[PDB]
Design a protein around this ligand. Structure first.
Ligand SMILES: C[C@@H]1O[C@@H](CC(=O)O)[C@@H](O)[C@H](O)[C@@H]1O
Ligand SMILES: C[C@@H]1O[C@@H](CC(=O)O)[C@@H](O)[C@H](O)[C@@H]1O
Ligand SMILES: C[C@@H]1O[C@@H](CC(=O)O)[C@@H](O)[C@H](O)[C@@H]1O
Ligand SMILES: *C(=O)C[C@@H]1O[C@@H](C)[C@@H](O)[C@@H](O)[C@@H]1O
Ligand SMILES: [Ca+2]
Ligand SMILES: [Ca+2]
Ligand SMILES: [Ca+2]
Ligand SMILES: [Ca+2]
Ligand SMILES: [Ca+2]
Ligand SMILES: [Ca+2]
Ligand SMILES: [Ca+2]
Ligand SMILES: [Ca+2]
Lengths: 114, 114, 114, 114
């Protein structure tokens, strides 16, 4: 199944943060309405924040996270969870190798902000 | 119900990161097996990272997040989500006022690391 | 009588540790030379350590502990005890309510260290 | 004279917390009714908390603290202090070598909890 795609409310600001747990350098692309809005690169085996920014969901509200390492797409896992019917997390894990810890790049989207 | 308390696998490194979205200065305390292990503080109304750090879950794996603003505890919502039986997120939202957006301090715990 | 004030030997490392046994969120201020040197906050009814720190007694050796819950100073009990003319504990109890168990925040200062 | 043994009220929750101040790894065993109830181990020269736990008095209320380093028992000092006839500290210092600072393992027992 498709992973890493989330439909946010239209024209809503959200935060996106990325963490790295791999010897390989993680590049994370966040696409808004099928166009790229932010790009994080970094290497870390200790969960360092390689990127975090605020973006707007736009007309569409379509948000997609992709994870490449050295030009190889990583296998993604994802889900959205909503607490008290109002606080939202869109969650992405990814695997770049064979150990299946799916933490090599971890991406957290949260809204609303402010 | 108790919120913000999570049982992790024993002696496991985990990441904890807090973002803020409130006029009020947020204070996040992270206790591991009933000893405070990390303390974040900051103020932001557009999701700034006010703290991030790697901790070990220790013998019993008990992690608790608490959020206060000027000595008053905020009301917490929480849940844990597990993807592909391997990647864990423990999620905390908090409300320090009356608007109930529960994003005033947002805390994300993730594991495994490395 | 004043409680929670102790005169340490000047320029001496000491440990300070706070426990909580209250439904109320405890805020422990530790002042050295009448300036706040450390602040702990936390909530527990099972004696969690809500803060621990190593500090220096400074020029004056004067250390003071203050406890409030939601801005209300608690009533303090204190004493100092010295074992084999060497081992020092400065002890603080505090009550934030009416049951007078004086365990709501418990603060223990010990020296020498090392 | 015997040190590190205290008669608590029967069937009473109490906290026990240990600090290390030595190059040697300290092992702290807490016996309730002559039976091992908790074991802490660790090494620090900066008063790090090597263990905290809540235990029960039991029928006897007999609590005893023992400290060993590399197998060899440390010499203990102890006293109990009661403030406002209600808040109890049972206090232990230990010496594992020659300098007689008696802080090599420091254990604080306090009650009541809650
Ligand atoms: C240190 C390792 O780095 C990667 C493989 C090599 O490269 C990751 O996929 C593994 O999970 C692990 O984090
Ligand atoms: C700017 C506001 O700050 C707080 C209220 C005080 O003031 C938060 O509870 C609100 O959600 C909002 O972030
Ligand atoms: C660092 C030293 O470690 C021990 C001796 C050596 O070993 C302790 O007895 C001393 O008091 C001091 O803490
Ligand atoms: C409640 O506000 C008062 C408070 O919490 C109780 C659980 C108990 O610990 C009591 O001693 C404390 O004052
Ligand atoms: Ca991997
Ligand atoms: Ca990894
Ligand atoms: Ca709010
Ligand atoms: Ca808010
Ligand atoms: Ca009380
Ligand atoms: Ca109490
Ligand atoms: Ca010694
Ligand atoms: Ca020592």
């Amino acid at each position: 199944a498709t992973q890493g795609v989330f439909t946010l409310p239209a024209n809503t600001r959200f935060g996106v943060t990325a963490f790295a747990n791999s010897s390989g350098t993680q590049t994370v692309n966040v696409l808004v309405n099928n166009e790229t809005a932010a790009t994080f690169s970094g290497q870390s085996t200790n969960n360092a924040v390689i990127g975090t920014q605020v973006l707007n969901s736009g007309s569409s509200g379509k948000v997609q996270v992709q994870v490449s390492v050295n030009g190889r797409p990583s296998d993604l896992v994802s889900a959205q969870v909503i607490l008290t019917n109002e606080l939202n997390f869109a969650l992405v894990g990814s695997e770049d190798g064979t150990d299946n810890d799916y933490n090599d790049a971890v991406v957290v989207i949260n809204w609303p902000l402010g």
